[PDB]
Amino acid sequence: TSAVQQKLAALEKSSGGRLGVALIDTADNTQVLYRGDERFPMCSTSKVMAAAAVLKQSETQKQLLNQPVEIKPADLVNYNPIAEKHVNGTMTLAELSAAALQYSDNTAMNKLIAQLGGPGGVTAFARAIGDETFRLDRTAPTLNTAIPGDPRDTTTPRAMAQTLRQLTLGHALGETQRAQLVTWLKGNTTGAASIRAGLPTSWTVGDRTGSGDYGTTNDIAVIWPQGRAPLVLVTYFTQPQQNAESRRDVLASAARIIAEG
Ligand SMILES: *C(=O)[C@@H](NC(=O)[C@H](N)c1ccccc1)[C@@H]1N[C@@H](C(=O)O)C(C)(C)S1
């Protein structure tokens, strides 16, 4: 095991939880993995797959992103910071995708899922781009139960890192779609204390966070250092106590360790 893996193992030991990390350095397509093949609950990081699946649809339905979607009182769930502003009005699928990706809006996630025909349509898009690991089984917010050992709504760090690379830096999407996903991710507002907090602050970052029960605290990021090929970093973390507190600092610390090596 490398020096970076020993430092990640020590961070994990210090934290009392279970840490999964996958880095892809696209300059060499080298990988750094820590529990990279173990399953973790994705929580809201699954929003990237859902938004990208709608973007993939928009390659054929050219005006799909401007299609209005009604926001109704029954659509509201546990956390709806943007959609609650539009109850009994409408939001476009673009406005819903931005709400999901930039504010972690769970109503917006559910509208994306509905546009895809259910959670099976999100998983289908994962399989269509070569991700055999991702599975989405539930809508928001029950996809965040993060129960230890439950295979529902999980992926592995290695698989999520590979998928995030193909969506944002590869060509799993069309050029306008991929650029739109990059813009949305760069504009995320919920990640300041997660991967972003452990990285040199002249690196541009796009990321999507997630949180759930068992103190599950997740972040997935595409990172553009200046003068270097970009990297993809996935950091997943979960804890033994059902009511455990969020630990965004562990994700920052993992990113910092990765950025060193
Ligand atoms: C996705 O992770 C979403 N999580 C939830 O709705 C959870 N039920 C939850 C966990 C902890 C606190 C509140 C809700 C949304 N994304 C989260 C995130 O980006 O970390 C969230 C906490 C903003 S809600």
Residue numbers in the entry: 26 to 57, 59 to 238, 240 to 252, 254 to 289
What do the study authors state?
The structure of the E166A/K234R enzyme acylated by ampicillin was determined to 1.6 Å resolution with one molecule in the asymmetric unit. The E166A substitution blocks the deacylation reaction, which allows trapping of the acyl-enzyme intermediate. As anticipated, the structure reveals ampicillin covalently bound to the enzyme via Ser70, as indicated by an Fo − Fc omit map. The carbonyl oxygen of the acyl-group makes hydrogen bonds to Ser70 and Ser237 main-chain nitrogens to form the oxyanion hole. The C3 carboxyl group of ampicillin also forms hydrogen bonds to the side chains of Ser130, Thr235, and Ser237. This Ser130 rotamer is the same as that observed in the E166A/K234R apoenzyme with a χ1 value of −60°.
Structural results suggest that the slow acylation by the K234R enzyme is due to a conformational change in Ser130, and this change also leads to decreased inhibition potency of clavulanic acid.
